[PDB]
RNA sequence: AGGCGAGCAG
DNA sequence: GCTGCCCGCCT
């Protein structure tokens, strides 16, 4: 859910898939592990996989339509989420 | 005294009949049969003890006049926890008809102060008149003291039946069947439309040939329309009465619709397909497979392209009728590709003559690719070996014969019975790819080993628990069935006659068969036990480790790896080359493991592996393509994807640029709409309601 | 979170 | 034929 939310949140503000690719990877400090399991997804939440559908931003509201988080989670609207 | 060679069985009312032929065929119904109940005493009581008490309860509840009652000694070394190894047992024959409750089992846990264990509770009647009589496979049975047979007799019990030494097996009437087939898009039901039917009652010629046929939209026989045709089919076919009827995919798709044509039409004769006389059907017509089986009991269903027919066809891809054909006879046949939703078999003559004699041709084809690849013997010799249903043996079972064989060599021996990897190298491999079969691993390590019931201790309340290796039950059996084998090579080492020589053929597969299933009895199961299991899994695993390092030696490089096969890469582009390699590392693995006889299987001249089970390749026999596990093999990928995809592997820098060039014309192709729609026809089945779906 | 493929135990 | 769990893959 955090990754849902922060990606297409990074999209929304204008990253491009390229250095999206780079910061995500910069991020996890294996690359084997990575193009097997997390470019398919992250390239297809941009819409450049499957159906072609650049997925719109999640809102407030469908931030907060998502299972609430619990440890080891951080998405959400911290106005809930936190105390 | 009365004669009958028996062939198959059925049960009804708490009563056993066995269909047989006295030649014409003949019944004889059992009844008196006992299911032989044996309770274990407690500690401190005797058999006497558990008659006084339980026999007057069992008279009580199932009111009998008399009850037979003896002591017998027997042995247990099975897998249920603290039942001791030997012991006095009770042995009641409680009949399977009783006045009341017949339907009614003792449960096996019934815990009294004489007996605290029972045995035999639930079992069955075909199965305890075949273990008690000791009757191996169909025989001869001496025979002393309904149906749409001419002969019917009965016998008032069980032991009236004895069996026969007597090797042979008298003629047979057989029949072929191939059924052309409609589909309605209104019921979505297929709809008979002409039968071919050709009795072979003794390149073979029939002795008879027939054809039915009903027009689809408006000797030969012709009818108004399906009922009056289905009708005379049931007539005729009690007046042929044959003794195994044959065809291809008999087993889940034509015998399957003939029988639901049978009832939408509401035929009283449909007990014609098998032998016994019924007048309604079953109540509740999965399942359907099974009423089916039980009604046709009584005729014999000889498929051809089914499981273990195409066991015996391995170089069949799609076994449909004109492959088998060819690959079994060496005869061209094209197939006619005949839809009766076209108008013109509604008023052109010529063409539903041309569909007549396309479902003869079927017709025949069928039959002599039957009696050909000789599925009839090689079943009736696995059968006499194991002692269970050859009916069961042509349906295509696994727990079939790994437990009717156990049965009966265990009961012949007074033993009480419980109740009822290497990572494959993928890519192209240039040079030749030999199949070996290591479908002899697993027995060979219980001979050697001497792992069974009775050798290896295992703590039988902790079944995850590996226990120690120790001659035994099971080992003896396999070493008897191995040295029967033995001596067959013998004979075929010596004999002159083809004749005989391919009956010894016949007779060193089954045992091969017959060896090489007998995993399936505590591996998968009425003889599961998870220790001896897990036991030879390792010991196999070690055996397959020497081999990986014995090929390492030999300048080998496996590509692929299993209990079942083992996959070499000879280093050699030459057919000679590759067989003495393969001939050398089967010598030297048979030397490592003198009871561990392996042989090449198959020949790839160019090999594409993809994954375990996900192959392609070049087999040699001449050269032939072979596929198993990509795209082409699925129902989800058109027929336009599976000529794609063969020719794709028939060219494999040439050969890349020519799939450049052959994939832009099939793009030409496409994008102008210049290929038939039928060849980019797509298949998927719903294994349950179309609504009833998530995704 | 869902579907296609297997293997396991009931 | 039906369920649970393990991994591999796609939306
Ligand atoms: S309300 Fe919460 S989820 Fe919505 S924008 Fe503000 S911080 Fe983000």
């Known amino acids: 859910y955090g990754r849902q939310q922060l990606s297409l949140f990074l999209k ?24 097997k399991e997390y470019r398919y997804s992250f390239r297809h939440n941009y819409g450049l996989e499957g159906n072609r559908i650049n997925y719109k931003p999640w809102d407030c509201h469908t931030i907060l339509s998502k299972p609430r988080p619990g440890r080891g989670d951080y998405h959400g609207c911290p106005f809930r989420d936190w105390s | 005294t009365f004669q009958m060679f028996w062939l198959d069985y059925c ?43 339980i026999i007057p309860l069992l008279m009580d509840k199932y009111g009998l006049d008399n009850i037979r009652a ?31 409750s017949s339907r009614d089992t003792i449960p096996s846990d019934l815990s009294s102060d004489t007996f605290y264990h029972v045995f035999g509770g639930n079992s069955n009647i075909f199965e305890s008149f075949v273990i008690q009589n000791r009757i191996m496979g169909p025989c001869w049975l ?68 027939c054809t039915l046929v009903r027009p689809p939209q408006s000797r030969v026989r012709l009818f108004n329309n399906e009922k009056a045709m289905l009708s005379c089919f049931c007539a005729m076919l009690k007046v042929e009465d044959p003794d195994v009827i044959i065809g291809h995919r008999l087993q889940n798709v034509y015998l399957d619709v003939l029988a639901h044509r049978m009832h ?23 399942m359907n497979h099974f009423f089916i089986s039980d009604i046709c009991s009584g005729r014999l269903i000889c498929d051809i392209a089914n499981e273990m027919g195409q066991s015996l066809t391995p170089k069949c891809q799609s076994w449909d009728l004109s492959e088998m054909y060819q690959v079994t006879c060496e005869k061209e046949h094209k197939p006619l590709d005949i839809d009766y939703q076209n108008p013109q078999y509604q008023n052109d003559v010529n063409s539903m003559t041309m569909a007549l004699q396309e479902n003869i041709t079927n017709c025949m084809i069928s039959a002599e690719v039957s009696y050909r690849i000789q599925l009839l013997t090689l079943t009736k010799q696995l059968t006499n070996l194991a002692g269970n249903a050859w009916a069961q043996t042509l349906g295509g079972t696994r727990a079939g014969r790994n437990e009717y064989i156990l049965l009966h060599e265990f009961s012949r021996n007074g033993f009480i019975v419980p109740d009822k990897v290497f990572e494959p190298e993928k890519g192209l491999h240039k040079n030749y790819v030999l199949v070996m079969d290591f479908n002899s691993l697993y027995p060979s390590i219980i001979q050697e080993f001497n792992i069974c019931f009775t050798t290896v201790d295992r703590n039988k309340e902790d079944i995850d628990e590996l226990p120690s290796v120790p001659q035994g039950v099971l080992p003896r059996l396999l070493a008897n069935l191995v040295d029967r084998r033995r001596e067959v090579k013998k004979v075929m080492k010596t004999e002159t006659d083809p004749h005989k020589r391919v009956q010894c053929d016949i007779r060193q597969q089954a045992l091969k068969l017959t060896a090489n299933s007998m995993y399936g009895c505590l591996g998968y199961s009425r003889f599961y036990a998870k220790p001896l ?42 057919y000679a080359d ?8 089967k010598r030297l693995v048979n030397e490592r493991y003198r009871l561990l006889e392996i042989d090449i299987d198959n020949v790839f001249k160019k090999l594409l592996l993809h994954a375990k089970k996900k192959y392609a390749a070049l087999t040699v026999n001449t050269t032939v393509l072979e596929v198993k596990g990509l795209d082409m093999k699925r129902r989800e990928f058109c027929p336009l994807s599976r000529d794609v995809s063969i020719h794709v592997l028939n060219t494999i820098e040439e050969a890349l640029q020519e799939v450049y060039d052959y994939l832009e014309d099939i793009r030409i192709k496409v994008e102008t709409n210049n290929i038939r729609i039928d060849k980019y026809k797509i298949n998927m089945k719903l294994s349950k309601d179309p609504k009833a779906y998530p995704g």
């Open chain 1, 12 to 35: 929304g503000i204008g990253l491009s898939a390229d250095e999206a690719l780079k910061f995500w990877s910069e991020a996890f400090t294996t690359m084997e592990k990575f193009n």
């Open chain 2, 11 to 53: 049960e009804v009312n708490n009563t056993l009949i066995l269909f047989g032929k006295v030649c014409v065929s003949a019944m004889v119904q059992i009844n008196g049969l006992c299911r032989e109940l044996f309770f274990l005493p407690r500690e401190g009581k005797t058999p006497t003890d558990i008659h006084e008490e």
């Open chain 2, 70 to 100: 003896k002591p017998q000694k027997m042995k247990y070394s099975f897998e249920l926890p603290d039942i001791p190894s030997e012991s006095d047992y009770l042995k009641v024959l409680l009949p399977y008809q009783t006045p009341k």
């Open chain 2, 142 to 209: 001496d025979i002393k003291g309904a149906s749409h047979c001419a002969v019917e007799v009965s016998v008032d019990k069980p032991q009236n039946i004895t069996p026969t030494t007597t090797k042979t097996m008298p003629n047979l009437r057989c029949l072929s069947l191939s059924i052309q087939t409609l589909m309605n898009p209104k019921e979505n039901k297929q709809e008979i439309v002409s039968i071919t039917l050709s009795a072979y009652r003794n390149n073979i010629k029939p002795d008879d040939l």
């Open chain 2, 264 to 286: 939408d039409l509401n035929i009283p004769t449909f007990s014609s397909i098998g032998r016994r006389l019924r007048r309604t059907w079953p109540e509740k017509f999965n």
């Open chain 2, 533 to 574: 299991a897990m036991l030879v899994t390792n010991k196999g695993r070690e055996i397959l480790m020497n081999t990986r390092q014995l090929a390492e030696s030999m300048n080998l490089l496996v590509v692929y790896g299993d209990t079942d096969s083992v996959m070499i890469d000879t280093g050699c582009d030459n």
């Open chain 2, 578 to 585: 590759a067989i003495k390699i393969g001939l050398g590392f």
